[PDB]
Amino acid sequence: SVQNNKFDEFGEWLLKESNGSKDDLPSDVEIYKRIVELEIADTPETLQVLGQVLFDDDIINQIEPHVGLLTKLINGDEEFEKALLGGLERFFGLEKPNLIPQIPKILHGFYDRDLISEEVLIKWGSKVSKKYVPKDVSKKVRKAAKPFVKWLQEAEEEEEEESD
Structure with a gap:
């Protein structure tokens, strides 16, 4: 069997305990505990795992329930927000590509x-990267996200403008 790290083991645990249903995921409290016990509360890649494992086709309604968990882990750190977005890139690109047209809404x-944050989304959406997914997959996902990225840029520019 293939050699793994604490991040692989975390992901395997989540998938096994939940079987094939996100409803049967361990509670957010139990997920956080596991992260602490694995000593990966201080590492961005934890959020990459959650970004791709936590959700399914009903992702639009699964955001609010996990806000406590995700906000606690991110701790205002942009490196962690980036990792979450990386995980979402894998979710859209590899897990549920049927949801790619709905990426701006999500x-x-x-x-x-x-x-x-706006800064993370803008930097993410202004390039392609093979870091989280293959480059070809990255292009699809980030092109699909462009309308929302444009909106964020435009929103922030107008916000700066109305401050004379």
């Missing part, structure tokens, strides 16, 4: 819950 949901 990312807006994450943004409204203070989960991903």
Whole structure:
């Protein structure tokens, strides 16, 4: 069997305990405890795992229930927001590609819950990267997100303008 690290083991645990249903995930309290016990509360890659494992087709309604967990882990750190977005890139690109046309709507949901900052989304959406997914997959996901990224840029520019 293939050699793994604490991040692989975390992901395997979540998937096994939940079987094939996100409803049967361990509680957010239990997930946080496992992260602490694995000593990966101080590492961004933890959020990458959650970004791709926590959700399914009903992702739009699964954001609010996990806000406590995600906000606690991110701790205002942009490196952690970036990792969450990385995990979401894997979710959209590899897990539920049927949801790719709805990416702007979904990312807006994450943004409204203070989960991903404007600066992170803009930097993320202005390039492609093979870091989280293959480059070809990255292009699809981030092109689909462009309308919302444009909106964030435009929103912030107008905000700066109306401050004369």
